[PDB]
Design a protein around this ligand. Structure first.
Ligand SMILES: [Zn+2]
Length: 258
């Protein structure tokens, strides 16, 4: 028995095991485009993924991760509202059971079909485990997915999902270039947030891109065939693994564009 996205262990139940769920800087949040403030001080994002080394793709039960080698500054994120170098460690998605829902962040209450999260940690802290204990430990790039034209760079991920259908399954996933998942523009909003899953730690500096990237209905359909359960257990489709928007409270969302 543990947390999940069901009716008896869903987001509304998390606070019982993780009190920080009712914290002051929880994520996700609704981005009100007319309240976000343009900040001329914000610098352009610097994404250097040319030397990225993907290693494996694993079904964690609540989502699947595509892990990268973070033993050196191979794939890093710099600039923007960040101070220092952040290394990419893994990326994952959250999606819905229908095309009208699935994203965690919303824009003027608009929900997208899915949301991609590219997780990076601040190298000044040594390792990921130490970074999550700091207020500026992580820097997560969020990208919205809308249903429309297929995204070529995502097909490689889609085709291997059959091999990691159930919880605990993993597969080698080398030579995947994350640059194929980025939109044309890097304009973004940013705000201080948390992880969206337990342990819900408030160590994130969120960088949500304005431009969504289009994927086909066929591609998203395959995400919906994954299982929350482990092999040999009752089947429960991995869908709607998103947390609803939380109170913004004492925070301001800044935009890199006007
Ligand atoms: Zn996420």
């Amino acid at each position: 028995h543990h947390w999940g996205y069901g009716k008896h262990n869903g987001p509304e139940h998390w606070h019982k095991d993780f009190p920080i769920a009712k914290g002051e800087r929880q994520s996700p949040v609704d981005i009100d485009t007319h309240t976000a403030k343009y900040d001329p001080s914000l610098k352009p994002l610097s994404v250097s993924y040319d030397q990225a080394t993907s290693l494996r793709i694993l079904n964690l039960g609540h989502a699947f991760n595509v892990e990268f080698d973070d033993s050196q500054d191979k794939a890093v994120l710099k600039g923007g509202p960040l101070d220092g170098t952040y290394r990419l460690i893994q990326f994952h998605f959250h999606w819905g059971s229908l095309d009208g829902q699935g994203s965690e962040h919303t824009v003027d209450k608009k929900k997208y079909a899915a949301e991609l999260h590219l997780v990076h940690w601040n190298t000044k802290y040594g390792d990921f485990g130490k970074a999550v204990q700091q207020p500026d430990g992580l820097a997560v790039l969020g990208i919205f997915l809308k249903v429309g034209s297929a995204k070529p760079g995502l097909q490689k991920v889609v085709d291997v999902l059959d091999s990691i259908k159930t919880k605990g399954k993993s597969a080698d996933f080398t030579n995947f270039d994350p640059r194929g998942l980025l939109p044309e523009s890097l304009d973004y909003w940013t705000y201080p947030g948390s992880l969206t899953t337990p342990p819900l730690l408030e160590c994130v500096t969120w960088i949500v891109l304005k431009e969504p990237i289009s994927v086909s209905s066929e591609q998203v359909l395959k995400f919906r065939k994954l299982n929350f359960n482990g092999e040999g257990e009752p089947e429960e489709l991995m869908v709607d693994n998103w947390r609803p928007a939380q109170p913004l409270k004492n925070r301001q969302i800044k935009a890199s564009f006007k």
